[PDB]
């Protein structure tokens, strides 16, 4: 036997950081969950009980906290790049660092219409994420994403003209509910190293803001022919607005809301134009995926 | 043997309802999860296989959908009262209906600064809940609550002057992080029946709004001596603002954020006044509970 | 305003303990999650920022670990009694300790048909639990439970002769699937203190084993008329087998498995006697509860 | 813009099937969760609102139930192959079917030492899984796995001789707890189509049984130098025992159990040789991955 592939490190490292402006009193908080997995000349740790090649996962955890102490943790694309670059530069035998960051929302509270200097609310479990792959000799590959953005529209969704055969029961509809959890990923041009990442820093927050705004506006305004057709419009708009993105990927559940026929009870009319009460379906769910690039 | 207590019915009934203003085009959505459990002269279903006394849980589910079709589903205090009253009035042998409703957030989207007529976002997993106990001859007992309201303040939290003995390691602090998930419950005066509930309908949304506003403002503005002292201030303010509430109950985790001593690494200073990077603790957690009434 | 009720302490305290027989080499592991909440003369911590009455939740956590070091952690009824008794005896102003323990399964591995001396498997997420309420002057109230015991029978379940009215669509059946997650609780006679608990120690493991055996055998062998009728048989048998139990409580979901009519496709027969493929329903679920005592 | 990649279908399809031997009365149950995603000439559904190319996700769901009715659902490698082959053969424009199956445990109950004919227990949340990729012109690629197999050993785990630098605090140890959740995957030789899969059917259950037995025996018996060294031994043994497997992959968390120094309290000794009470750590966790092939 032989090792064909190997990576190891520390997962689920919870990190908080505070910035304190001691001139204004304004405090800003950041909270994330970090995973760092390393690759390199480590096969002997598996094959020969050779722990000399192991940078302990416990040491990787310490390094995450130290790096957060020594650097801004925002945007997460930059933090992940600094952290990944540390491992491949520090250790001659480590050749790749794979950094995943989940950013948790701490939105400043408005109290009596004024932003509070040091109080925050988790406005929803929506995440901003990065996957930063730092590969010696191959630069820095960044995928940025938003996930767990849960939305619903009560009309201006349609689904008709689909294939109908002996497996088909689904009625065509010209007016349905559409609800999803948005998972949207934008894949950056390869960066040569930390300098090139730093040269583009403002684009990270700006492209995340664009991706979110385009997702919400397209969802709300598209008289949707399908999940497929609506998600493609989101992707093409995001590509049009940031030349440093190569691809946009959407992964969208179709979280079904079924009509309830109540006509068996006192002739109640609750279908078609009279549909008011629906049964949200926990499972199963449509799952629709696209990766869109430049033609 | 004998039945000392019995209740049964349907749990986890997911319900959606849409209101459509066909004059303005504005659509409004409501989504909840409903549980209805019945009590009454039902012991023989347990003791003698006597299913004649069982209103099938499947029929309870149908009744939830029918009631939602025939009535507004807001405020949940009213909906729960209508639903509970249905079972004790319809069935001579059913003497109590216990209705629990969890209300899910669907907040109207703002697109280009304008409220969208039919698109919504789940802004966080915060819930508004009711427990409505409709008991034949004993009226309607309502407990209203907000839950899963997750907040953090980065300073203006203290914890000192606690008991110190041979079991104590905790350092006193005059400046710490405080984070919790707010579970706040207000218990209404007993109502005689549906008419009395209906006579107070506006107070339900108003008292929920008060409970939330008081929670957020007190949390943000109290230079906290403890979770105990801060939560008591929230309760006393809510009681002062609604005479139809008898008690306010808070159940608050203390979601700890630990300092990380980094002085072992290049003399890094990350404690006390220099604390920037913290380790959020998933478990264990302080758990602090109060029920506050009028003196 | 005034404090009507108050309790506080530490939740979600994960504890592991190992016993090592250094004569046989056999090691035995225990893992639990502990919650301790205290009551007593603590209202001033809420009303006057008086932290002098607070035994810090951090100190409660330390005390859990110290108590586990100084005592066996099995059976959990005894451990919870020792832990609760510590707080009301140690602190003059603490008058109640409420101890909840969840016991996690670590079942010894059988390797090549021989029990391994120090390797364990989590055979399912089934829990053994206790709630121990130690109240100064009122002794020790223990509720023992098993929970998350997930079972299914593919036949010998029936449901007919239930109430049928204008809310009813459910077809009577003489042959259905029955599946549940068993939550069974047995409530002990009040104990005067730790000595009386210790005098009954063997009964705790024996009564848990009885409750589990009776649950499984009754579920498997009862040609069930309803969840109600089957659960009552379990309760009456457990009461018959342990005179120191006062009540037995079951809380059982009816985890529905729906027939799928496939007759629309090539006349496939998949209902009634021909039913082979079913759709497990995640929600909603029947929820059936009983408390059974001696007549 | 252009579609670079696209797949869609139905996720989270819960399926139950019963087999009834009407000669012996013995009933056997199967429960799974199925996902089917299709690829093919479907880009116009995204780009031009062309629903004619869409086999509705609802129809994919119907097809899963119909296929389960018409075929055995075991082993899952065969069921997934039949299901995937259906879509690429039935639809000229569908060129790939990606079938993921999670198999849920329903283990026959033993009542009074006799196997019960129709009663089952979920002995733990351990899963048996398949990923079956059926690609027109490229045959059938199967990855088999077991997941959520949670184990602990209380000794005969070591971790020393790892890299020590200015980022390192971890003490070397010659005796620690090792606990993990086993995720093990074996990747089959490419199969030309359904006939070749069928020709190997007995090997699926046999190789799953081998993978589980080798995992448990190696974990229990290896005086472990690291997670790396132990998992490699499992992989090399599984490869040695089934020539139709090309690779074995393990993904293992190191679920840490920390010593608790209690020497601050009455000089209690709970470290090193005296360590009895430990603090299970929910997060962070080491994460160790290998893919092993033939040299
Ligand atoms: O088995 C282990 N492998 C590692 O890579 C590691 N790092 N810290 N502890 C560890 N234990
Ligand atoms: O066993 C059952 N009990 C009930 O009360 C019920 N209601 N619907 N189905 C049911 N099954
Ligand atoms: O606010 C707090 N209340 C307490 O009771 C406590 N105990 N430890 N830390 C604490 N913080
Ligand atoms: O938007 C949709 N896309 C689909 O592919 C689909 N299939 N069923 N319903 C559907 N809705
Ligand atoms: Ar952070
Ligand atoms: Ar969409
Ligand atoms: Ar609703
Ligand atoms: Ar608070
Ligand atoms: Ar334990
Ligand atoms: Ar039952
Ligand atoms: Ar199945
Ligand atoms: Ar291992
Ligand atoms: Na390197
Ligand atoms: Na009645
Ligand atoms: Na006392
Ligand atoms: Na095809």
Are C248 and C210 spatial neighbours (Cβ–Cβ below 8 Å)?
no
C-alpha C249/C-alpha C237 separation (Å) is 12
For residues D66 and A167, the answer to whether their CB atoms sit within 8 Å is yes
Q: Measuring CA to CA, which residue among C57, A21, C128, A93 is closest to residue B286?
A: C57
Q: Which two tokens stand for residue C249?
A: 């409580």
Are C29 and D154 in contact, with CB atoms under 8 Å apart? yes
What is D271-286 written as a DSSP string? SGGG--EEEE--S-EE
Three-state DSSP state, B12? strand
The residues facing C145 across adjacent strands are C129, C185
Structure tokens at D170: 């971890």
- Cβ neighbours around D112 below 10 Å, total: 9
Question: Which residue shows structure tokens 């205090």?
Answer: B77
Closest CA to B87 of B144, B7, B18, B197: B7
Query: Please, are residues A156 and A223 in contact by the beta-carbon 8 Å criterion?
Result: yes
Write out the CATH class of domain B1-295.
alpha beta
Residue C74 parent element (H or E): none
List the structure tokens of B239: 């009681």
Closest CA–CA distance from residue C245 to any residue of chain D (Å)? 24
**What is the CB neighbour count within 10 angstroms for residue B234?**
24
Q: DSSP 3-state assignment of C149?
A: strand
Cα angle C144, C31, C125; round to 5: 70
Is the Cβ–Cβ distance between C40 and C94 less than 8 Å?
A: yes
Question: Are B158 and B229 in contact, with CB atoms under 8 Å apart?
Answer: no
A-chain residue closest to C281, CA distance:
A283
Residue C159 assigned as binding residue: yes
Reported structure resolution in angstroms:
1.7
Count CB-CB contacts under 10 A for residue B73. 25
Per domain, the residue ranges of chain A are 1-295
How many Cα atoms sit within 13 Å of B135 on the Cβ side? 8
Backbone angles phi, psi at B262, to 5 degrees: -110, 10
How many residues are there in chain A? 295
Spatial contact of C269 and B34, defined as CB atoms under 8 Å apart? no
**Which residues neighbour A65 within 8 Å (Cβ) at sequence distance 6 or greater?**
A15, B260, B262, B277, B279
Alpha-carbon distance A30 to A34, whole Å? 12
Judge whether C218 counts as a catalytic residue.
no
Q: Which residues line ligand 1 (CB under 6 A)?
A: A 8, 54, 56-58; D 159, 170, 226-228, 254, 286, 288
| Nearest Cα residue to C136 out of C101, C91, C189 | C91
Which pair of tokens denotes residue B183? 């579970």
Binding residue numbers of B for 5-hydroxyisourate = 57-58, 159, 176, 227-228, 254
- DSSP state, B175? S
Contacts of residue A292, Cβ cutoff 8 Å, sequence gap at least 6: A232, A235, A236, A239, A247, A248, A249, D1, D2, D3, D4, D46
Cα separation, C162 vs B49, whole angstroms: 10
Q: How was this structure determined?
A: X-ray
Task: Pick from A3, A9, A187, A228 the residue to mutate for testing the D interface (most D CBs within 10 Å).
Answer: A228
Neighbours of D137 (CB within 10 A): 7
Q: Does the distance separating the beta carbons of A155 and B118 come in below 8 Å? A: yes
> Considering only alpha carbons, which residue of chain A is nearest residue B262?
A66
Residue D283 contacts B, CB cutoff 8 Å: yes
Find how far residue B136's CA is from the centre of its chain. 25
CA proximity to B130, closest of B115, B140, B117, B120: B140
* Cβ proximity of C82 and C68 under 8 Å: no
Name the phi and psi angles at B184, rounded to 5: -120, 130
Query: D230 CA to middle of ligand 12, Å?
Result: 5
Residue with tokens 């893992």: C31
State both tokens at C126: 């089934």
Determine whether C23 is an active site residue: no
What does the DSSP 8-state code read for residue C124? -
In chain C, how many H helices and how many E strands? 6, 12
Query: Look-up: residue for tokens 């088909």?
Result: A168
Which of the following is catalytic: D28, D57, D116, D247? D57
Of C167, C265, C282, the CB nearest to A166: C265
CA–CA distance, C75 with C146 (Å, rounded to integer): 13
Q: Which ligand is nearest to the CA of C181?
A: 10
Tokens of B87: 């079972």
Residue of B7, B37, B43, B51 best to disrupt the C interface, most CBs of C under 10 A: B51
Annotated catalytic residue, options C17, C57, C104, C116: C57
Q: Which residue, chain included where needed, has tokens 């008292």? A: B207
Of D155, D134, D161, the closest CA to residue D80 belongs to D134
Q: In whole angstroms, how far apart are CA D178 and each of A211, D225, D231?
A: 43, 11, 12
Breaks (C-N over 2.5 A) in chain A follow: none
Question: DSSP code of B53?
Answer: G
What CA–CA distance (Å, rounded) separates B79 from B132? 9
State the Cα angle at A279 between A273 and A285, rounded to 5°.
110
Q: Which of B284, C75, C76 is nearest to D280 (CA)?
A: B284
Query: Is the distance from CB of C1 to CB of C62 less than 8 angstroms?
Result: no
Q: Are A218 and A234 in contact (CB under 8 A)?
A: yes
Asked if residue D167 lies in contact with residue C129, where contact means CB atoms within 8 angstroms, the answer is: no
Specify which residues B97 forms β-bridges with.
Answer: B38, B134
Q: Which residues of A touch C167 (CB under 8 A)?
A: 265
Ramachandran region of residue B272, left (φ > 0), alpha (ψ -120 to 50) or beta?
A: left
* Residue owning tokens 């013995």: D26
- Backbone φ and ψ for B289, nearest 5 degrees, come out as -130, 140
Select from D120, D152, D215, D285 the residue whose CB has the most chain C CBs within 10 Å, as the one to mutate to test that interface.
D152
Backbone angles phi and psi of A169, in degrees to 5: -115, -20
What radius of gyration do chain B's Cα atoms show? 24
Radius of gyration for chain A, computed over Cα atoms and rounded to the nearest angstrom: 24
Q: A29, A1 in Cβ contact below 8 A? A: no
Confirm if A15 and B277 have CB atoms less than 8 A apart.
yes
Q: In three state form, how does the secondary structure of chain A look? A: CEEEEEEEEEEEEEEEEEEECCCCCCEEEEEEEEEEEEEECCHHHHHCCCHHHCECHHHHHHHHHHHHHHCCCCCHHHHHHHHHHHHHHHCCCEEEEEEEEEEECCEEEEECCEEEEEEEECCCCCEEEEEEEEECCCEEEEEEEEEEEEEEECCCECECCCECCCCCCCCCECCCCEEEEEEEEEEECCECCHHHHHHCHHHHHHHHHHHHHHHHHHHHHCCECCHHHHHHHHHHHHHHHCCCEEEEEEEEEECCEEECCCCCCCCCCCCHHHCCEEEECCCCEEEEEEEEECC
Contact C197, C78 (CB under 8 A): yes
C-alpha D40/C-alpha D59 separation (Å) is 17
Q: Does the C-beta of C252 come closer than 6 Å to ligand 10? A: yes
- Contact check, Cβ <8 Å, A229/D46: yes
Q: What angle do CA C275, C276, C277 make, to 5 degrees?
A: 105
Chain D, 240-259: which have a CB under 8 Å from a chain A CB? Answer: 240, 247, 249, 253-254
Sorted by sequence, the CB contacts under 8 Å of residue C129 that are 6+ apart come out as C76, C100, C101, C102, C103, C144, C145, C146, C147
CB within 8 Å: A289 and D232? no
Query: What single-letter DSSP state applies at residue C231?
Result: H
Give the separation between CA C219 and CA C227, rounded to whole angstroms. 10
Cα-based distances in Å from A258 to A152, B15, B105, C291: 14, 10, 19, 37
For residue C52, give the DSSP letter: G
Nearest to A141 by CA among A95, A101, A99: A99
CB atoms within 10 A of CB B167: 21
Q: Which residues pair with A245 in a beta bridge?
A: A188
Query: Residue C61: CB partners within 8 Å, gap ≥ 6?
Result: B284, C10, C13
Sequence-distant (≥ 6) Cβ neighbours of residue A146 within 8 angstroms: A126, A127, A128, A129, A182, A183, A184, A208, A211, A212, A215
Chain A CB within 8 Å of residue D239 CB: yes
CA A191 to chain CA mean position, Å: 20
Q: State residue A102 phi and psi, 5-degree precision.
A: -105, 120
The span from the CA of D38 to the CA of D63, in Å, is 13
| Contact residues on chain D for B283, CB-CB shorter than 8 A | 282
Question: Considering Cα of C204, then C210, then C216, then C218, what sign does the dihedral take?
Answer: negative
Question: How far, in Å, are B38, D169, D236 from residue A50 at the CA level?
Answer: 65, 19, 17
CB-based contact A157:A176 (threshold 8 Å)? yes
CB atoms within 10 A of CB D241: 13
Is B49 exposed, middle or buried, given 0-12, 13-18 or 19+ CB atoms closer than 10 A? middle
Q: Would you give the distance in Å from CA D37 to the centre of its chain?
A: 19
Strands B127-135 and C127-135: unpaired
- Is the shortest distance between the CB of B30 and ligand 7 below 6 Å? yes
Do A194 and A81 contact (CB within 8 A), yes or no?
yes
């Amino acid at each position: 036997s032989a090792v064909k592939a190997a990576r190891y490190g520390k997962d689920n490292v919870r990190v908080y950081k505070v910035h304190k402006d001691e001139k204004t009193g304004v405090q800003t908080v950041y909270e994330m969950t970090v995973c760092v997995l390393l690759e390199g000349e480590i096969e002997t740790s598996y094959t020969k009980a050779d722990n000399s090649v192991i940078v302990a996962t416990d040491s990787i955890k310490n390094t995450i906290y130290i790096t957060a102490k020594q650097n801004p943790v925002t945007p997460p694309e930059l933090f992940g790049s600094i952290l990944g670059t540390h491992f491949i530069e520090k250790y001659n035998h480590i050749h790749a660092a794979h950094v995943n960051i989940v950013c948790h929302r701490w939105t400043r509270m408005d109290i009596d219409g004024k932003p509070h200097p040091h109080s925050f609310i988790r406005d929803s479990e929506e995440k901003r994420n990065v996957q930063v792959d730092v590969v010696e000799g191959k630069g820095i590959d960044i995928k940025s994403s938003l996930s767990g953005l849960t939305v619903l529209k009560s009309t201006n969704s349609q689904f008709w003209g689909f294939l109908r055969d002996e497996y088909t029961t689904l009625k065509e509809t010209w007016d349905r509910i559409l609800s999803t959890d948005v998972d949207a990923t934008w894949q950056w041009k390869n960066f040569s190293g930390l300098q090139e990442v730093r040269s583009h820093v403002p684009k990270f927050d700006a492209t995340w803001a664009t991706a979110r705004e385009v997702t919400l506006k397209t969802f709300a305004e598209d008289n949707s022919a399908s999940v497929q057709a609506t998600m493609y419009k989101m992707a093409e708009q995001i590509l049009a607005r940031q030349q440093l993105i190569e691809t946009v990927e959407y992964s969208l559940p179709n979280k079904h809301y079924f009509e309830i026929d109540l006509s068996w009870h006192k002739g109640l009319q609750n279908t078609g134009k009279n549909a008011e009460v629906f049964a949200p379906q926990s499972d199963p769910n449509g799952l629709i995926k696209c990766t869109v690039g430049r033609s």
